[PDB]
Symmetry: C4
């Protein structure tokens, strides 16, 4: 398990990556 703030930050990080890829695609 992780600190809740770390889980949240990682979810945000992944969504950022998805949105970046979709933007470029």
């Amino acid at each position: 398990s992780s600190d809740p703030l770390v889980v949240a930050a990682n979810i945000i990080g992944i969504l950022h990556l998805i949105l970046w890829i979709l933007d470029r695609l």
Copy 2:
């Protein structure tokens, strides 16, 4: 919970994202 260095790195990562968005906005 997380390693303190990981918590710190994630806080920095999120602030970086906020500042990036504000810069572009």
Copy 3:
């Protein structure tokens, strides 16, 4: 140990970095 979602996100983050470097190289 970390949340499995955090491990996964970090692996993805590192692969992203590798692919970015290889793209620029």
Copy 4:
């Protein structure tokens, strides 16, 4: 504490940020 791979990934992430800032500066 965190998975060792997560600690490593976060250290790499921070160094990446430092090198990016120094490059732009």
